[PDB]
Design a protein around this ligand. Structure first.
Ligand SMILES: CCCCCCCCCCCCC/C=C/[C@@H](O)[C@H](COP(=O)(O)O)NC(=O)CCCCCCCCCCC
Length: 208
């Protein structure tokens, strides 16, 4: 019943007719990713908590007195910039602003998209560990302190084989998994592109 396709396709729900990035569905989709990650039984389950803690921050903003301004990422950015609830230069009175919090998930989404795309078009003899590192170095690595970068990089060598990873998506044999990624990744890509435009245009790509 539960599989990676269900999660990827849930990202369709994150964009409305005006391509507002809706926060509730975004959270729901990320909870799907966490459940998938935890199902893989790798050492990276050690880091699921960081995602979960970030989702809870966002859920608490959605449960608060300004909940309506957190309905979409676009609304969130407008509200937090106009009320100075985002630390722009250095961490200060708003260490857990919606803007800086969502940024971390967004960067991770970028990594995930690069990793899954890499996997989708990889040769049969490609190593999962290499797909992960190359995509990590492309993306998330620059935002992590050296101690984290080095530990993550080493941990990559302990990942399952390409075949096992594809089968773990639970959508059939590797060949079916590969076609699934092609049909489903565009949903996560669209969410990423719209979110990246939002952050880029507001010069928020480097929030502390
Ligand atoms: C299945 C193999 C998964 C490979 C995942 C490779 C990337 C792992 C990154 C681990 C980062 C170390 C944990 C804590 C990092 C935090 O410092 C940063 C910055 O947050 P801040 O401290 O400023 O609040 N947090 C992040 O970069 C977000 C956590 C990354 C989530 C990884 C996505 C895994 C989802 C997999 C779903 C298939």
């Amino acid at each position: 019943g539960f599989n990676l396709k269900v999660v990827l396709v849930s990202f369709k729900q994150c964009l409305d007719e005006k391509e507002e990035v809706l926060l509730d569905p975004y959270i729901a989709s990320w909870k799907g990713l966490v459940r998938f990650l935890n199902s893989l039984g790798t050492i990276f389950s050690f880091i699921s908590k960081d995602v979960v803690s970030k989702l809870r921050i966002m859920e608490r903003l959605r449960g608060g007195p300004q909940s309506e301004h957190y309905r979409s990422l676009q609304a969130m950015v407008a509200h937090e910039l106009s009320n100075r609830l985002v630390d722009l230069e250095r961490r200060s009175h708003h260490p857990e602003s919606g803007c800086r919090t969502v940024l971390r998930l967004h960067r991770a989404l970028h990594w995930l998209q690069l990793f899954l795309e890499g996997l989708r078009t990889s040769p049969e003899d490609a190593r999962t560990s290499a797909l992960c590192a190359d995509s990590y170095n492309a993306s998330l690595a620059a935002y992590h302190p050296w101690v984290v970068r080095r530990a993550v990089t080493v941990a990559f060598c302990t990942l399952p084989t390409r075949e096992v990873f594809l089968e773990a998506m639970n959508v059939g044999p590797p060949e079916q998994a590969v076609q699934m990624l092609g049909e489903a990744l565009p949903f996560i890509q669209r969410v990423y592109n719209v979110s990246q435009k939002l952050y880029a245009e507001h010069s928020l790509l480097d929030l502390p």
